[PDB]
Amino acid sequence: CPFDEVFNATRFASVYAWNRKRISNCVADYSVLYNLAPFFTFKCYGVS
Amino acid sequence: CNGVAGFNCYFPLRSYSFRPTYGVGHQPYRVVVLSFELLHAPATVCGP
Structure with a gap:
């Protein structure tokens, strides 16, 4: 399912x-x- | 990960940061577990 158009927008x-x-x-x-x-922040709360 | 932080390189420890202000279901609790072994032995320990 499309995550390209929501990120490559x-x-x-x-x-x-x-x-x-x-x-x-x-x-x-x-x-x-x-x-x-190269280098971005990836933090998630609730699940590993 | 050559022992350095980065993506897919996470330090496997986390903190609580308890404050007197959180809700009743989030404060720290102190837990102690007692383990017995009811078998045949010299019976070192028992009560009054």
Whole structure:
């Protein structure tokens, strides 16, 4: 399911108009969330 | 990870940071566990 267009997006949204998306009925591959760049912050609360 | 922090290189310890202000279900608790072994032996220990 598409995470490319929500990350490789040309135009983003303002802080007061923070952009919403809902994802359901898909398979999520959270490994290809690695080459966004050298050095980025990845913190998650609740699960390992 | 050559012994340095980074992505996929996480230090396997975490902290609590207890403050008097959190909710009733988050304060520290003190736990002690007593283990016995009821078998055949010289019976070193028992009560009054």
